[PDB]
Structures are given as C-alpha cells and as structure tokens.
Amino acid sequence: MRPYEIMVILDPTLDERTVAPSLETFLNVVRKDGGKVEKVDIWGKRRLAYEIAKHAEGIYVVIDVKAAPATVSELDRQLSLNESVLRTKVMRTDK
C-alpha cells in the first residue's frame, strides 16, 4: 500500500454541491481492494494558467490516497474516461 497523491481538475460547469458526492463513486473502488483515503481537499474554482479544453476555469481536487499500485492505475483510467475530469496527475509522496 503505497501513498499516492492524485490531483484532479474538474469541469467548471459543475456545481460544488455535487463535486464530493460524484467522486465518491470513484473512491469506492479504492476501498474494495484494501485502499485507504485520507484527505479529499477541494480547492474549488481557480483560474487556469492556460485554456485546457476550451475552458478558462476549473475545480481542483486533491485525493491523497494510499493503496496498491494496481488499484491506483485502475482509478485514473476511470477518471480520464469521465467527461467531467479535465486533467489527472498521480504522484508518489514518499522517497
């Protein structure tokens, strides 16, 4: 179970009432395999430094997960297929 940190940029035409319930469907596939979720910090709207996919705004979400590598690579495959997600960035946090 390695500590990962997944950064998700969401489409700004969503609403902040359904940002955290929507990605709870994604995070439940981590929990089936022994994964652990710690910090689901949502930064909200922020001006993007350049126009990603004809949008100038976007919702930044930091996942802060801790699971097996086979399940984290399973997750961001399902995140890029979701049409609300603009970008995904997965990084390890240890050395």
Binding site: M7, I9, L48, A49, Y50, I52, R87, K89, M91
Partner: protein
C-alpha cells in the same frame, strides 16, 4: 547562501505555486542556478516542481 539548505525541511512542492513565483522570470522561464544561489540538488528540485506545475496549469509555460 542557499535558502533551502539554510532553512531546513522546507517542502519544495508543485502545489505551492507561490514559492515558485520567485525562481521564475517574467517570461516564465526557470532562472539560472548562479542567480538564485541554490545548490545542485535543490535547483533540481525546483525545476521539477516548475515542470509539474506547468502541466497542472498552475504556472504558464510561456507568458510575456
């Protein structure tokens, strides 16, 4: 002379898009090593943070 070596355990982070506004120039380019006083290892850690911040749209690749 190096800020990160003097002040210990300071996190060089791609999230922290306010530490990375110093150590870049007005076009957006990564500053030289001999003008910021960094060591070799932290100049490595700064430039990777800038390359990772540019790809999450926290810093522009180029901006006049």
């Amino acid at each position: 002379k190096c800020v990160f070596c003097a002040k210990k355990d300071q996190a060089i982070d791609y999230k922290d898009t306010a530490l990375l506004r110093t150590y870049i120039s007005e076009r957006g380019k990564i500053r030289a090593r001999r003008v910021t006083g960094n060591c070799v290892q932290h100049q490595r850690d700064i430039a990777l943070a800038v390359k990772n911040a540019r790809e999450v749209a926290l810093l522009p690749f180029t901006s006049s």
